[PDB]
Design a protein around this ligand. Structure first.
Ligand SMILES: [Mg+2]
Ligand SMILES: [Mg+2]
Ligand SMILES: [Mg+2]
Ligand SMILES: [Mg+2]
Ligand SMILES: [Mg+2]
Ligand SMILES: [Mg+2]
Ligand SMILES: [Mg+2]
Ligand SMILES: [Mg+2]
Ligand SMILES: [Mg+2]
Ligand SMILES: [Mg+2]
Ligand SMILES: [Mg+2]
Ligand SMILES: [Mg+2]
Ligand SMILES: [Mg+2]
Ligand SMILES: [Mg+2]
Ligand SMILES: [Mg+2]
Ligand SMILES: [Mg+2]
Ligand SMILES: [Mg+2]
Ligand SMILES: [Mg+2]
Ligand SMILES: [Mg+2]
Ligand SMILES: [Mg+2]
Ligand SMILES: [Mg+2]
Ligand SMILES: [Mg+2]
Ligand SMILES: [Mg+2]
Ligand SMILES: [Mg+2]
Ligand SMILES: [Mg+2]
Ligand SMILES: [Mg+2]
Ligand SMILES: [Mg+2]
Ligand SMILES: [Mg+2]
Ligand SMILES: [Mg+2]
Ligand SMILES: [Mg+2]
Ligand SMILES: [Mg+2]
Ligand SMILES: [Mg+2]
Ligand SMILES: [Mg+2]
Ligand SMILES: [Mg+2]
Ligand SMILES: [Mg+2]
Ligand SMILES: [Mg+2]
Ligand SMILES: [Mg+2]
Ligand SMILES: [Mg+2]
Ligand SMILES: [Mg+2]
Ligand SMILES: [Mg+2]
Ligand SMILES: [Mg+2]
Ligand SMILES: [Mg+2]
Ligand SMILES: [Mg+2]
Ligand SMILES: [Mg+2]
Ligand SMILES: [Mg+2]
Ligand SMILES: [Mg+2]
Ligand SMILES: [Mg+2]
Ligand SMILES: [Mg+2]
Ligand SMILES: [Mg+2]
Ligand SMILES: [Mg+2]
Ligand SMILES: [Mg+2]
Ligand SMILES: [Mg+2]
Ligand SMILES: [Mg+2]
Ligand SMILES: [Mg+2]
Ligand SMILES: [Mg+2]
Ligand SMILES: [Mg+2]
Ligand SMILES: [Mg+2]
Ligand SMILES: [Mg+2]
Ligand SMILES: [Mg+2]
Ligand SMILES: [Mg+2]
Ligand SMILES: [Mg+2]
Ligand SMILES: [Mg+2]
Ligand SMILES: [Mg+2]
Lengths: 124, 207, 62, 144
RNA sequence: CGCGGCACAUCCACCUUGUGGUGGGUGUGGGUAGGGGAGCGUCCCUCAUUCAGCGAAGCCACCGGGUGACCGGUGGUGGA
RNA sequence: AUGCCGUGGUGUAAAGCGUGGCAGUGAGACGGCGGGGGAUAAGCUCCGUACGUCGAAAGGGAAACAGCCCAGAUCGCCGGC
RNA sequence: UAGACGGUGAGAGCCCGGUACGCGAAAACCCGGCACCUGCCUAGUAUCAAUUCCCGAGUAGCAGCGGGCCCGUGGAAUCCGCUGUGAAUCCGCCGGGACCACCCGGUAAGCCUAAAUACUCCUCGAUGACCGAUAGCGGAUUAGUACCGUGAGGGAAUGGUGAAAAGUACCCCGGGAGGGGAGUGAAAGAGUACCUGAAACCGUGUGCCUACAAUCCGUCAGAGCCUCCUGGGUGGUGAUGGCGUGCCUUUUGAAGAAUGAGCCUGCGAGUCAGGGACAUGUCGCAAGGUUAACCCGUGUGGGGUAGCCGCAGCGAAAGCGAGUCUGAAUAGGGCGACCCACACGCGCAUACGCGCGUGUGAAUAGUGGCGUGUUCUGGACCCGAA
């Protein structure tokens, strides 16, 4: 029972090259070079799926802090204020409403200021 | 238990008793699988051969000197990595027959025959053709009246040539001698039909 | 072919009724003058082969 | 009915063969050898221990000789004679070969393990002392 | 930590209370050498069954699918 | 002082032990602590250390940066600490 | 009695060659018979008695040196070679593992001898869980050819139109090649560069991006264009932001400026044998299990008990034996036996139990088969020296 290899062998090659469409140079043309880049691509994608959770929250905090200092509060103390006020709205929606509904964001700043301790700097 | 002997082109003449300790053995699936695979292994003739690097023509010299050519060192033009070279671990002639114990063979036989008898796929017939000149037409008609389904074993004595010739040419019909009964053939057939003397010879040989 | 048992092992080990492999002990062949009787009696007789020699010894005998 | 395709090996009877050196997901490149030394390419003989005098050479030969002329006896015990011959009677070498307590075509001696409650007339080769003792105690006879 | 999916080990309760399934716990699931377990794909044979010149194989494209090896559908090409 | 041996309680699933099958490994590295050699040099060398990490460990920190610090990646999330 | 197989314009028992089956040989060769022929016998037999003679020579034996047997010279028997010495003819001589005695066996130094055994250049007939053009023979093809070597030697590569050449008349461009149109064909998406026609590789057209940017070439985030469908969703592209040190081997440690890889396609490495060994999974039978050769069967089936393992061990051994060895030991130690779960049955404890027996384990306890891992001897996972 001599078995030709091609029929079985080409399956993974087709999958690798199809996944490697759009790559430039040999990385989209040559299975050996596409496979190396596929290992890197999937490692990168795995890394970046859990890195984007920090990336988007970094961006949300940037936007939240910008809106906060338009309403004359640091992000520092606005987050205290919402914690103390018991507001559990996460920074996804805080940033998104800082963009879409700035007046509601100003209201949230007002409640955060109110919840802040009078001397934010003395020990508790 | 009670299987009546059917006559070709006619009515039942008598009946024959089918001993329980021999046609009612419980079916042992693992046992019969073992026996059937050993049987097919013995059927395999295993004349498959390739040529190792030492049996391939030529290939005696070292093709070029070990060092300095800039090529991989090779040692022989018939090394397995070469096209046209020897085959590594390739098929060599083998005998695949196994040494299954006798009572394992016998138990598999009785299990298969018992399974046929238990739902009534075993018949006994006086003769396949009522005469001496073999006739496939009459043998086929009578077998079709006996069973209407494709795979029938016929167990006839070696001294009946007319029946053997008259069923030899029917598709789905397999002929065995009583002493040649075997698990693979009975399990392939969905109907096993004995001649009277063949079935009696089987019962007598098996006590 | 058929496996050949190791000759020297077959003359230095044997099996007991329950399958234990026994052996005699070294240092009783010569230079016996300075060896006190406690040591020669310790070295006398047969002992069971050590647990971590058992596998190689069985392989040799088989 | 039971056909050729209703036939199947017993569970666990047919284990798969480990195909070595067939990629990283299984026993991969080095095929379980892991090594770069002798074991990576060859076998180490069981008799070799790196150069110290091996176990089959450190130790002395077992003492003694084997007797070329040793007479070997198949063994039957009066206990199993009692077991196989509850009613007693004549007991012969051929008889207890047939009943299966002793190999054929060998000198057989009777030993005294077990109880005898059977009136037995045993004709064997070279009984044991306790064998005769309980054979006669049960009322039987022990004859060469 | 939250919410959802999977897996392994083990425990408790129902179902032929161990071939074991179901529900729920608890713990666990980075990994080289290496061990153990379970699978994918190719070819050949047997048995059964089912497709195929109203178009098989192979190949190509697209759309889908599975926890993985991989799989399916549709169309094109093709000719057993 | 630790460490070690025993013992009695308490706690702790994947402890331990015996005996089989199959191993690989037997080139280690650095860091902490105790020492030898060295010139109380070496990214040196040689030991000790129920010491660690790397090896075989990704993630975060240390600009970069096996061996340091934090922390051990079953998968997903554009949630939180 | 034919449904073997192959061919025939696609899977044919009934179209063809055939097949089952039945016939068939001038001659040659083979085989056998009858003759003819050749050779042997037609004269011995029995008994008595053991007086005489006969049995195969430079041989045996012996010594030396070697060889060969399990025997590697050992106390070296048997057998063989050479050297020396060198017998005897049965009231002899040789062997029975130094040797001696006894006893047993046999007749060396002459020859011939069928069958069972080995093999296949070659001839028929079949077959294949064998290969299918880098495979299978080196050789489907000029194949031991071409080619290489002075030579011995070494030694390739190259198969497929179509069912049928119907192999493209004729016309046009072109010197031709090649092509276009016509035509043949089911198909020219079969045109003697020809079945299918992958990849590397090379163009052409086209959508997006790209000439201020430092890029392991991707990944995540992400605008804008383009496309195709219902602002939305596909598919293409990707301005811009972040992250991000190839793969393999081998290393304490490599992105490493250590190794290997130009690319693609094809090929290229734990295999097989054995009643081998160990361990396990599974199945059969079970105090038994199993056959080997071989025999008989169209087969894989049926016989086949020789043997093997289990059945008792201890001891150097004689031997003894549930014991045995050491030992002076009714001392101690070593090794070995006290074999399993469920049940009944007894000689009986009030009904509940020591022992002993049936049984039921159809893993009991072994044994045999089959699978797997390891191992042994083989090239033994593959490749590689000098
Ligand atoms: Mg791109
Ligand atoms: Mg996070
Ligand atoms: Mg050669
Ligand atoms: Mg060579
Ligand atoms: Mg070849
Ligand atoms: Mg047989
Ligand atoms: Mg001595
Ligand atoms: Mg002394
Ligand atoms: Mg690799
Ligand atoms: Mg090693
Ligand atoms: Mg090493
Ligand atoms: Mg290596
Ligand atoms: Mg030495
Ligand atoms: Mg893991
Ligand atoms: Mg983890
Ligand atoms: Mg591993
Ligand atoms: Mg058509
Ligand atoms: Mg079509
Ligand atoms: Mg195919
Ligand atoms: Mg597909
Ligand atoms: Mg399709
Ligand atoms: Mg298709
Ligand atoms: Mg070392
Ligand atoms: Mg070392
Ligand atoms: Mg060290
Ligand atoms: Mg120090
Ligand atoms: Mg150092
Ligand atoms: Mg240290
Ligand atoms: Mg790290
Ligand atoms: Mg880190
Ligand atoms: Mg960093
Ligand atoms: Mg916080
Ligand atoms: Mg045909
Ligand atoms: Mg001589
Ligand atoms: Mg000799
Ligand atoms: Mg003579
Ligand atoms: Mg003669
Ligand atoms: Mg002769
Ligand atoms: Mg002969
Ligand atoms: Mg022949
Ligand atoms: Mg032929
Ligand atoms: Mg070829
Ligand atoms: Mg020439
Ligand atoms: Mg034309
Ligand atoms: Mg045209
Ligand atoms: Mg036409
Ligand atoms: Mg076509
Ligand atoms: Mg071409
Ligand atoms: Mg073509
Ligand atoms: Mg620009
Ligand atoms: Mg820069
Ligand atoms: Mg980028
Ligand atoms: Mg390492
Ligand atoms: Mg180095
Ligand atoms: Mg490099
Ligand atoms: Mg470089
Ligand atoms: Mg190097
Ligand atoms: Mg290179
Ligand atoms: Mg002994
Ligand atoms: Mg004792
Ligand atoms: Mg069993
Ligand atoms: Mg196998
Ligand atoms: Mg080699």
């Amino acid at each position: 029972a001599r078995v030709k290899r091609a029929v079985n062998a080409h399956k993974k090659r087709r999958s690798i090259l199809k996944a490697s469409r759009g790559y430039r140079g040999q990385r989209s043309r040559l299975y050996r070079k596409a496979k190396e880049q596929q290992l890197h691509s999937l490692n990168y994608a795995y890394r970046d799926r859990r890195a984007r959770k920090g990336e988007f929250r970094k961006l949300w905090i940037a936007r939240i802090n910008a809106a906060a200092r338009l309403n004359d509060i640091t992000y520092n103390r606005l987050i205290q204020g919402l914690k103390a006020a018991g507001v559990e709205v996460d920074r996804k929606n805080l940033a998104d409403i800082a963009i879409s509904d700035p007046a509601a964001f100003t209201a949230l700043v007002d409640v955060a200021r109110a919840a802040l301790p009078e001397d934010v700097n003395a020990p508790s | 238990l009670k299987i009546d002997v059917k006559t070709p082109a006619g009515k039942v003449d008598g009946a024959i008793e089918l001993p329980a300790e021999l046609f009612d053995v419980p079916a042992n699936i693992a046992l019969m699988h073992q026996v059937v695979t050993a049987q097919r292994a013995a059927a395999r003739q295993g004349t498959h051969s390739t040529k190792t690097r030492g049996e391939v023509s030529g290939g005696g010299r070292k093709p070029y000197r070990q060092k300095g050519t800039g090529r991989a060192r090779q040692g022989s033009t018939r090394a397995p990595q070469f096209t046209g070279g020897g085959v590594v671990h390739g098929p060599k002639p083998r005998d695949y027959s196994q040494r299954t114990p006798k009572k394992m063979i016998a138990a598999a036989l009785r299990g298969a025959l018992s399974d046929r008898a238990r739902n009534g796929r075993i018949h006994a017939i006086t003769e396949l053709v009522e005469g001496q000149n073999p006739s496939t037409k009459s043998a086929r008609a009578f077998l079709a009246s006996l069973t209407e389904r494709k795979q029938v074993l016929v167990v006839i004595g070696r001294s009946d040539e007319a029946g053997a010739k008259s069923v030899r040419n029917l598709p789905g019909v397999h002929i065995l001698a009583p002493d040649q009964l075997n698990t693979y053939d009975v399990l392939r057939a969905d109907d096993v039909v004995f001649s009277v003397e063949a079935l009696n010879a089987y019962i007598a040989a098996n006590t | 072919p058929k496996a050949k048992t190791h000759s020297g092992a077959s003359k230095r080990f044997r099996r007991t009724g329950t399958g234990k492999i026994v052996r005699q002990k070294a240092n009783r062949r010569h230079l016996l003058e300075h060896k006190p009787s406690t040591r020669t009696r310790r070295l006398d007789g047969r002992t069971v082969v050590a647990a971590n020699d058992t596998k190689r010894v069985t392989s040799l005998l088989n | 009915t039971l056909k050729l395709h209703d036939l199947r090996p017993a569970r666990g009877s047919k284990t798969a063969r480990t195909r070595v050196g067939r990629g990283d997901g299984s026993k991969g490149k080095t095929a379980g050898r892991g090594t770069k030394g002798t074991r990576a390419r060859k076998q180490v003989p069981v008799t070799f221990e790196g150069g110290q005098m091996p176990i089959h050479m450190r130790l002395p030969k077992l003492k003694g000789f084997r007797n070329r002329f040793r007479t070997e006896y198949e063994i039957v015990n009066v206990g199993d004679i009692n077991r196989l011959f509850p009613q007693g009677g004549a007991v012969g070498v051929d008889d207890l070969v047939a009943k299966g307590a002793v190999r054929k075509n060998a000198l057989v001696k009777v030993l005294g393990d077990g109880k005898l409650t059977a009136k037995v007339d045993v004709s064997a080769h070279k009984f044991s002392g306790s064998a005769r003792a309980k054979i006669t105690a049960a009322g039987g006879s022990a004859t060469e």
